[PDB]
């Protein structure tokens, strides 16, 4: 038989295989791991998600409730100022807002809202002049 | 100043920026999101770890206390048949191992140890012939 396997990561964060065959005949079995770095969409998204600070929490926990079909954010949410499209890897989206939607002295938030995201993918905007 | 801005997912899934200016003389703002798709070994690496099925989830625990420096596997872990280093993106690794170390009617598992993947990176090793 052969006396090696070729297992990878695959874009689903999973190995691309469920099962390893060892033949007893070999007296040695070498696995060979690849890591091609890719991930799909639907595990490894991000978008950009405008609110007030005190709005985010709500925004975030009704928007990875939306799913990925609402680039998770609820839809015709109020708290969200603005958002981008949830992307994959490779690709890029715009969002264009009214500045007259902030205020002076507010402060305000942005994240992702792909589940678990807003945790590490977070910042301040705030409004100058 | 400018009515735009480029922002980016890192390697460490954080945005590279974590403030944003808007002037209040810009009538609209937009935001340009982009998703390299590239993530660095300490936030998204792979390993291959052998074990007995019942030692699995000892095997792991202990291996994701050990840290990335043992390739999140304890050292001399009596339970670990065979593993490989923890990878990133665009790297491969191999190890091999004496098939002798594998014995009929009992029950093989292998996982990724890195911490989180477990759930989902997993399959069964099978003595064949
Ligand atoms: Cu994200
Ligand atoms: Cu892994």
Do not use: K, T
């Given at each position: 038989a052969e006396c090696s396997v070729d297992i990878a990561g695959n874009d689903q964060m999973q190995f691309d295989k469920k099962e390893i065959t060892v033949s007893k005949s070999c007296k040695q079995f070498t696995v060979n791991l690849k890591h091609p770095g890719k991930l799909a969409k639907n595990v490894m998204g991000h978008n950009w998600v405008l609110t007030k600070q005190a709005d985010m929490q709500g925004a975030v926990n009704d928007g990875m409730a939306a799913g990925l079909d609402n680039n998770y954010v609820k839809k015709?949410?109020?708290?969200?100022?603005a958002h981008t499209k949830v992307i994959g890897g490779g690709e890029t989206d715009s969002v264009t807002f009214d500045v007259s939607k902030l205020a002076a002295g507010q402060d305000y938030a942005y994240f992702c809202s792909?589940?678990?995201?807003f945790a590490l993918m977070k910042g301040v905007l705030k409004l100058v002049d």
């Open positions: 015709d949410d109020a708290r969200v100022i792909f589940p678990g995201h």
